[PDB]
Amino acid sequence: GILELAGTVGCVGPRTPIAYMKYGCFCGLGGHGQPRDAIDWCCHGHDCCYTRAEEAGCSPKTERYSWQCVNQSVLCGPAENKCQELLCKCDQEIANCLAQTEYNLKYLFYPQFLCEPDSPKC
Ligand SMILES: C[C@H](CC(=O)O)c1cccc(-n2c(C(N)=O)cc3ccc(OC(F)(F)F)cc32)c1
Ligand SMILES: C[C@H](CC(=O)O)c1cccc(-n2c(C(N)=O)cc3ccc(OC(F)(F)F)cc32)c1
Ligand SMILES: [Ca+2]
Numbered sequence: 001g002i003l004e005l006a007g008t009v010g011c012v013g014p015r016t017p018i019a020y021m022k023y024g025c026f027c028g029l030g031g032h033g034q035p036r037d038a039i040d041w042c043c044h045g046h047d048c049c050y051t052r053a054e055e056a057g058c059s060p061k062t063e064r065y066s067w068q069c070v071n072q073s074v075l076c077g078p079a080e081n082k083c084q085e086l087l088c089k090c091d092q093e094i095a096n097c098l099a100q101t102e103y104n105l106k107y108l109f110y111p112q113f114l115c116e117p118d119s120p121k122c
Contacts, residue, residue: 001062005091011069012095015103024107025115033115036107042097048122049090058083060090067092072099 006017024040025033026047035041050060065084068075074095076088 001060001064001087004065004067004088005094007069008067008074008088008091008095009098011074012072013099019103019108020098022109024110025112031115032117032119035120036110037104038101039098039103040107042094042101044120045097046090046094049093051122053083053086053090056083056086058086060087063087 009017009020020027020039020043022028024036024043025031026035026040026043028043031043031047035044053060063083065076065088066078067088074088074092076085076092079085079088
């Protein structure tokens, strides 16, 4: 869920998870358009990951899972079911993706009216 999303992102990367609440066209609730930069691409991939988990019968926003932060790396588990492993994998993936990025301040609170109706495929 959102609790673990924040935690995992914080674990691996250098910045407050707040930084991704509203960034580019994809970091934030929903998302559509051309991803603006590497960060936005990470969020696009993560949005896609969450869609796949919803399609698998999981609740990515709320469902709790266990994980550990070791040397700024996320280790997933232990899992009780497949949804916990799927969600941890999604969040681990975005945490790793974002940690390798430079933050572009100009995409913080980027206006939604500039984001295109069409998006890249998942
Ligand atoms: C966005 C940017 C992330 C980057 O450069 O890496 C940044 C820079 C400096 C401080 C913060 N920053 C932090 C923090 N610990 O760095 C907490 C916090 C809380 C609210 C807030 O304002 C807003 F508008 F971004 F929510 C901004 C907040 C974020
Ligand atoms: C869960 C929902 C997925 C949806 O609709 O799209 C959502 C809502 C708001 C922000 C994010 N969201 C995304 C994202 N894929 O949009 C990346 C990310 C990274 C850290 C983070 O931390 C915090 F604190 F903002 F929650 C929040 C983050 C996700
Ligand atoms: Ca999103």
